[PDB]
């Protein structure tokens, strides 16, 4: 079985595993985390846990750019995410 | 090559510009109207 | 043979065409699903 919410210890073992082996070994990193293994470690790192992921409030120009880009693109959200660099999930929940 | 091809589309890409995009779009609307097609609805809650 | 048809499908327009028939809520699902991120081994890129 895999999935469900992420504890602390799984994030911290994930960071620590990312320190020794990490940036693309993730099958090997899953060996340390049961229950969260191959794809989910990588997805936790890049979507939430990466440094520079900019978890702060949405300013004026970021909200401007996001609504401007939603009108320009339609639904392209993985492309929209780099420009606003607030990523994919952060764009979508903010937009909605 | 695909990363180049995708990256170049953001930079150069919107090829089907104004005239072609509206031309084919309007062509489909005239066609589908002439069929008297109906848009496929979102599937009802208890669709049999 | 029309060759390129899959690539050049340029999702901005496709949503409008799909928007017509496949009543818009599903149309955003279909075109947003094409956008997803392609992984091989250690190569990652977004299918814009």
């Amino acid at each position: 079985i895999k999935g469900g919410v992420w504890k602390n210890t799984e994030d911290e073992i994930l960071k620590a595993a990312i320190m020794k082996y990490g940036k693309n070994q993730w099958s090997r990193i899953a060996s340390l985390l049961h229950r969260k293994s191959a794809k989910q470690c990588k997805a936790r790192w890049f979507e939430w846990l990466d440094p520079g992921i900019k978890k702060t409030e949405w300013s004026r120009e970021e909200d401007e750019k996001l609504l401007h880009l939603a009108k320009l693109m339609p639904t392209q959200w993985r492309t929209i995410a780099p420009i606003v660099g607030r990523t994919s999930a952060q764009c979508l929940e903010r937009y909605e | 090559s695909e990363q180049e091809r995708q990256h170049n589309y953001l930079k150069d890409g919107p090829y089907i510009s104004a005239e072609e995009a509206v031309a084919i779009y309007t062509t489909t609307v005239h066609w589908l109207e002439s069929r008297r097609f109906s848009p496929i609805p979102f599937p009802p809650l208890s669709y049999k | 043979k029309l060759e390129k048809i899959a690539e050049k499908m340029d999702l901005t327009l496709l949503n409008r065409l799909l928007r017509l028939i496949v009543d818009h809520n599903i149309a955003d699902y279909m075109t947003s699903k094409n956008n997803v991120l392609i992984n091989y081994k250690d190569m990652n890129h977004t299918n814009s």
């Binding site: 009108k71 | 109207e33 848009p39 | 017509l20 028939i21």
Partner: peptide, 29 residues
């Protein structure tokens, strides 16, 4: 921001051209 939110909702929310109806307003910038 809020004036632009209304504007694009009238783009995204609409039913399709095959379901004739009043064109909801749009705003310039």
């Amino acid at each position: 921001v809020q004036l632009e939110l209304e504007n694009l909702m009238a783009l995204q929310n609409t039913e399709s051209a095959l379901k004739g109806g009043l064109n909801t307003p749009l705003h310039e910038s």
